[PDB]
Ligand binder design. Structure first.
Ligand SMILES: NC(=O)C1CCCCC1
Length: 165
């Protein structure tokens, strides 16, 4: 029926900041949207709750989802360690776009990023699968703890997450 909505409750050094919610585009990328949905509810017995945004670059993006190595080298999908690029129907049009991190063709896992600018050079290379719905102000707040090389000045965590609606 209706595209799912998920939330993240963000904290900064363990202090609550606020909530970001996302629309996931199951109508266009059902397999990639499902992966992110189920990681967010934790229903397969693993997922995003307690993980961090390990790399944040102001004027670029906030990246997270590495719940096995905590640093951009780990993570796994609900389909296996890696899965294929589903399609590239949606493009990186500006701030708020949710897209899959990868290390080569057909290597999607659990890592994702939230754009904070237009990143058109990733079109056709990273699968876009959602967008921030509410709390873009919380994303901009998070983004101020990043740096040019992406190291964060305070620890940015998903204190809680799950499905709304
Ligand atoms: N190689 C990657 O997955 C990165 C692409 C640029 C945005 C952060 C994820």
């Amino acid at each position: 029926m209706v595209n799912p909505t998920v939330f993240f409750d963000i904290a900064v050094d363990g202090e609550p900041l606020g909530r970001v919610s996302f629309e996931l585009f199951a109508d266009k990328v059902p397999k990639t949207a499902e992966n992110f949905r189920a990681l967010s509810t934790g229903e397969k017995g693993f997922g995003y709750k307690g993980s961090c945004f390990h790399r944040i670059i102001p004027g670029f993006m906030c990246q997270g989802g590495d719940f096995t190595r905590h640093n951009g080298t780990g993570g796994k999908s609900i389909y296996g360690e890696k899965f294929e690029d589903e399609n590239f129907i949606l493009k990186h049009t500006g701030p708020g776009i949710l897209s899959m991190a990868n290390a080569g063709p057909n290597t999607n896992g659990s890592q994702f990023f939230i754009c904070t600018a237009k990143t058109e050079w990733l079109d056709g290379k990273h699968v876009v699968f959602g967008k921030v719905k509410e709390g873009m102000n919380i994303v901009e707040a998070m983004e101020r703890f990043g740096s040019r090389n992406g190291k964060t000045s305070k620890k940015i965590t998903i204190a809680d997450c799950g499905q709304l609606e």
